[PDB]
Nucleic acid binder design. Structure first.
Lengths: 122, 604, 218
RNA sequence: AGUGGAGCCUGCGGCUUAAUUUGACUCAACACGGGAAACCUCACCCGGCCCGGACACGGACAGGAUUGACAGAUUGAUAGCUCUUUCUCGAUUCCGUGGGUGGUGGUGCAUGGCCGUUGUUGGUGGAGCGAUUUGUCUGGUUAAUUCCGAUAACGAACGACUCUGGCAUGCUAUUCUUAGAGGGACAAGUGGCGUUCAGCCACCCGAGAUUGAGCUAACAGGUCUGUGAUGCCCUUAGAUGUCCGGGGCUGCACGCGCGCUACACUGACUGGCUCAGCGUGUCCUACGCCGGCAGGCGCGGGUAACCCGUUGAACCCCAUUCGUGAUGGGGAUCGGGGAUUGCAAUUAUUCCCC
């Protein structure tokens, strides 16, 4: 007969653990998304992983919906990883600058800066 | 013991008497009140005090539900609520048993009253994301068989529609986790329909409310389509028992056929599920619409302004339409298809041979009348198209020959003796399906020659001497003939006559001297089949010859075919003495021989 | 069957790297012995310099082990030196052979007088030092042979040095220090700069930068 | 609770003996050799019959070499392995002389046969010329290099293998020939059987749902008696020679130790009372008779949850006598009888009664 190998199983396990959202019911869309997610050099075991993720998502979809719910922090860790504010924190209106730093900027031809404020050491 | 006993009373003592007792309520008087006492006791036996017999208790509730649900429904809602409450435990080891018990209750009941007992809390807009009763949808999917379809309409259409709308609304809203969960939930809700289509009781009145809905769901909802197709298929397979139901299905078939044809013929999709649905849905429709669609499909095929993909799709539709037509349409389709058997395109020839297989597949009906009407022309055409048959087209064609050998008359020996070498060459064809068909077809000629004479053994001897010269020619066709004899030795075991088999075995040893690996492998398979099949008392006369023949084979073919020789030595050592084979083999094989002993030592 | 792990091993397994000197050109670490067995192969000869037993002191007691000093050499070209201690003498020998293959270095051969024919001796007098042992190699005229103690004689014959004068200093009685010192000197043959190598070096592409399109595939 | 103190018994030393057969000496020496030895079981002792190789040489034998043997007389033994009786047996020979000549020899060395599966320290990396070190650890935890974690260390031990074909009117110098690359097949889909999860079957589509190449050898996994014209030492100095009769293994001043019975009044004697379980049996016994009692006789069951056997147990309980002393406690050691076991009980086998 035929039996699945351990490498395809563990790679498919990592793939379902990471990006459950992108996978779908059709087989070749699973194949192409698995192709573009990770680095797999050879075609055959990539197709094996595609078949195995298709099988396990058919198995998971039949399973009562709660496994899918507990996959909630993955996206928050992702949205946190890629969070930016609306206004840049480096875009400050007035920045305090040492007199020696001001001399360095004057000697380096940026003497016409407008956002600078020279604070003398008191 | 107590569980088996209580199950025996529930199965034999109370189960046949549901019709006499009738429905029980909380205010029963006679034996119905005793059935209420039955359920009260078996529900009281579910509490925390037991906590170890829960497998047995849940089995008892399961058999109680499947015995008495339909007429004990007003009282068991409290125990259904308790069973739903028990699954909310942190660590419940009896989840499968509880699911089986709730499924048995649903199977005896139907989803409506048990949803009145334990409601689904996925009704539209929820606050949290941890649905506590999400197992009810798999339970309903796996265990609804005998309820009404109108409940499915009036409950599962608007709520699933709102869940789909909410999922897509959240899909443009950025949240992609809740949308996926709601899409999975609504797809799970749409998988209940094959369960609802199992044995409906009002499908003569409720199918009118689902025809346009199922049409639009199979038209512009791809994610449901397979299940949708399965639903209709499931319905047919166990729902056209009555006549008004089948009349309603045909009355809506007159609308569903163009839609399914357009979905199958579109370019790119689950084409094979649509094809199976079309096949069954043509087997349950009136023949005049079959003739009209067959004429339209023949017009579409014969049109030269059609693409190759469109031509192949309409040929698949022709394949589906072929076994369900009348005699005139089948004859006209055969007359149109007959010149296509010599086409150089392998796909067109494959579809034509599939048409010929499908029209000959029906044992009764207009296909059988067409077969007895055109047997001579079919034989002449199939013998004429033998030379120019492509390699994939071998796979259906043999089956078509199968479908014309099973009802073949006595004066047809020339056709068989002309088809035989093609059948052997197909026993060594590339396709495994073609090989299976050729093996089954050789078996079919074996049965067909058991009807042309009074004595079976001489008829099989004639059948063998019709295939004996094939052991003489080219190397690949000699290996073909050895594989054919290897297959033939397995079913008609004693009917050849062992001595004749022995002669064949001796000839195999000569072909065991060949340099080619395929011939040696086929000889080893024949030797294995002969050791399995023919008697040890006649083996003992012929052990020495075959074991000497395998003894002086080579080094290379001994090393390559080590597992087949290992199995042959195992079978010989099991069937005879280890020591006789030990002396009469050459040196090196001794080592392999001794290994078999620990199998006989340590399989015990 | 050899399945390489390093990028260098994968390039050597294919027909991308033609000679071992390319690996010497870019000073790359050789981590697989099959590269040496691929390029030099049957030309390599190996002499066991010394097998000696030790009693390694463990908490169960003193257990006997064998330490092998093995010099391997492509004649007219390359040498390596390896030391391995193991339980069995054959295990120690094969480990020392592997370790000496990993440490194969090329040696420079020059001329004593006029430059007619193939180079035979060292180009200049070179010195290798290991643990108070000093080994000095002096160019010799053709036909003299290796005038040395037996251990550097073995290494210098395996180097393809036809003839050389030798001067050793220190505790020569310890064999490992002596072999490592003469190995150090015959490596310093290419560590040395002469007026021959005064022209500016044109820089070619490294094997990792030249066959990167092949290396992304595997 | 005792042991060590006492009587008896057993073990080891020692002492005796013809022999008191034997390995082990503070756990693993000490009721271990199933070893509770009257014949065997014995390894010991005292005596007595018997014969103990091939080859070479010299004799006898067919004018019997030698084998077999009934009765009787002998020695400690029914010794035709001697005499009276010498009757048969047809070469299957036995009488001396010899010889590093030895063979049913002893022991060592070398290597192989019978069975299958395919806390220690390495491997790689870092440090040191090297012995070495790191891994194998601050802390907490654990029986523990265990676990959490830190961390120049990371990993470990004690035909389901690898490659690969069918079809490309696609890219490359390209639909008919090329040879590089890119596709395509993944059990993908369907229906059943299935712990509803591993898997199995069949089928549609598809060129392909499996067509070809490569992989006796290794073992420390177990364990055991074959090959050498093998080395030595022995061979009427039998590597325990067979058999026969009788002894001994028990002998006893003494040390070191396991045990049983006791020194009594919380007890000894006599009568009555009432309760088990693990196990056994073709020798376990039921019943009746003769018996003071050990035991005999005639009868049945049980090859066994059936018959022994409701296992009818003893301590214990209730009454009688004794009354603080070598006592009626304690029973050794002796003197007589009787009965079984066994060829045989004298050096008491055992049991019973004064």
């Amino acid at each position: 007969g035929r039996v699945r190998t351990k490498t395809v199983k563990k790679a498919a396990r990592v793939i379902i653990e990471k990006y459950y959202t992108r996978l779908g019911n059709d087989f070749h869309t699973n194949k192409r998304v698995c192709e573009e997610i990770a680095i797999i050099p050879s075609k055959k075991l990539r197709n094996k992983i595609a078949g195995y993720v298709t099988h396990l998502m058919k198995r998971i979809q039949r399973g009562p919906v709660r496994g899918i719910s507990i996959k909630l922090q993955e996206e928050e860790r992702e949205r946190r990883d890629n969070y930016v504010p609306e206004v840049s924190a480096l875009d400050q209106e007035i920045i305090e600058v040492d007199p020696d730093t001001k001399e360095m900027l004057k000697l380096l031809d940026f003497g016409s800066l407008s956002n600078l404020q020279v604070t003398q050491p008191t | 013991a107590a569980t088996q006993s209580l199950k025996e009373i529930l199965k034999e003592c109370v189960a046949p008497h549901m019709a006499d007792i009738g429905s029980v309520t909380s205010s029963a008087s006679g034996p119905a009140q005793s059935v209420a006492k039955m359920f009260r006791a078996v529900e009281e036996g579910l509490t925390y005090k037991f906590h170890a017999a829960w497998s047995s208790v849940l089995q008892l509730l399961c058999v109680f539900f499947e015995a008495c649900g339909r007429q004990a429904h007003p009282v068991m809602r409290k125990c259904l609520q308790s069973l739903c409450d028990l699954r909310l435990s942190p660590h419940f080891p009896h989840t499968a048993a509880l699911d089986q018990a709730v499924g048995a209750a649903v199977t005896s009941m139907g989803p409506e009253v048990v949803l009145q007992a334990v409601p689904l809390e996925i009704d539209g807009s929820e606050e949290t994301l941890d649905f506590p009763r999400s197992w009810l949808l798999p339970v309903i999917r796996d265990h609804v068989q005998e309820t009404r379809l109108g409940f499915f309409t009036t409950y599962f259409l608007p709520l699933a529609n709102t869940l789909k709308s909410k999922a897509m609304d959240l899909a443009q809203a950025g949240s992609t986790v809740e949308s996926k969960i709601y899409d999975t939930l609504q797809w799970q809700m749409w998988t209940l329909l094959p369960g609802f289509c199992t044995r409906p009781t009002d499908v003569a009145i409720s199918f009118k409310g689902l025809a346009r809905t199922l049409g639009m769901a199979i038209s512009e909802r791809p994610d449901l389509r397979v299940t949708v197709c399965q639903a209709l298929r499931t319905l047919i397979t166990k729902g056209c028992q009555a006549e008004a139901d089948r009349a309603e299905v045909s009355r809506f078939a007159k609308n569903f056929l163009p839609i399914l044809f357009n979905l199958y013929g579109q370019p790119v999709a689950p084409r094979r599920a649509v094809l199976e649905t079309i096949r069954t849905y043509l087997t349950i429709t009136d023949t005049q619409l079959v003739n009209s669609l067959l004429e339209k499909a023949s017009e579409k095929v014969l049109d030269p302004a059609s693409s190759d993909f469109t031509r192949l799709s309409v040929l698949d539709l022709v394949v589906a339409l072929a076994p369900c037509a009348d005699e005139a349409a089948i004859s006209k389709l055969y007359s149109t298809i007959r010149p296509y058997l010599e086409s150089k395109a392998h796909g067109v020839q494959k579809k034509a041979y599939r048409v010929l297989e499908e029209v000959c597949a029906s044992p009764q009906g207009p296909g059988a009348l067409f077969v007895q009407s055109h047997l001579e022309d079919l034989k002449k055409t199939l013998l004429d198209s033998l030379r120019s048959t492509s390699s994939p087209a071998k796979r259906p064609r043999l089956k078509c020959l199968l479908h014309i050998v099973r009802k073949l008359s006595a004066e047809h020996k020339e056709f068989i003796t002309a088809l035989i070498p093609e059948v052997i060459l197909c026993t060594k064809e590339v396709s495994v399906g073609a090989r299976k068909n050729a093996f089954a077809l050789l078996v079919e000629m074996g049965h067909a020659f058991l009807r042309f004479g009074s004595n079976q053994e001489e008829a099989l001897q004639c059948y063998l001497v019709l295939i004996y010269p094939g052991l003489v020619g080219a190397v690949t066709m000699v290996s073909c003939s050895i594989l054919a004899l290897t297959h033939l030795l397995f079913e008609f075991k004693g009917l050849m006559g062992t001595s004749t088999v022995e002669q064949l075995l001796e000839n195999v040893c000569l072909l065991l001297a060949s340099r080619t690996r395929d011939v040696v492998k086929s000889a080893l398979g024949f030797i294995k089949v002969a050791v399995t099949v023919m008697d040890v008392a006649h083996l003992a006369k012929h052990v020495q010859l075959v074991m000497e023949a395998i003894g002086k084979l080579s080094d290379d073919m001994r090393r390559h075919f080590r597992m087949k020789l290992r199995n042959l030595f195992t079978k010989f050592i099991r069937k005879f003495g280890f020591e006789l084979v030990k002396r009469l083999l050459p040196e090196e094989y001794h080592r392999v021989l001794v290994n078999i002993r620990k199998a006989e030592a340590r399989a015990k | 069957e050899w399945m390489p792990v390093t990028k260098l091993g994968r390039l050597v397994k294919d027909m991308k790297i033609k000679s071992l000197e390319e690996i010497y050109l870019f000073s790359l670490p050789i981590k697989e012995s099959e590269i040496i067995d691929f390029f030099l192969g049957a030309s390599l000869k190996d002499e066991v310099l010394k097998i000696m037993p030790v009693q390694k002191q463990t908490r169960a007691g003193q257990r006997t082990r064998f330490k092998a000093f093995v010099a391997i050499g492509d004649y007219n070209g390359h040498v390596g030196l390896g030391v391995k201690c193991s339980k069995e003498v054959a295990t120690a020998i094969r480990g020392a052979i592997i370790l000496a293959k990993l440490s194969i270095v090329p040696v420079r051969r020059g001329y004593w007088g006029n430059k007619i024919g193939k180079p035979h001796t060292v180009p200049c007098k070179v010195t290798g030092r290991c643990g108070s042992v000093l080994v000095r190699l002096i160019p010799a005229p053709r036909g003299t042979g290796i005038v040395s103690a037996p251990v550097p004689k073995k290494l210098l014959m395996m180097a393809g040095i036809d003839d050389c004068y030798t001067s050793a200093r220190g505790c020569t009685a310890t064999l490992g220090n002596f072999a490592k010192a003469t190995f150090d000197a015959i490596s310093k043959t290419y560590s040395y700069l002469t007026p021959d190598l005064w022209k500016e070096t044109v820089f070619t592409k490294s094997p990792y930068q030249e066959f990167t399109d092949h290396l992304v595939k595997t």
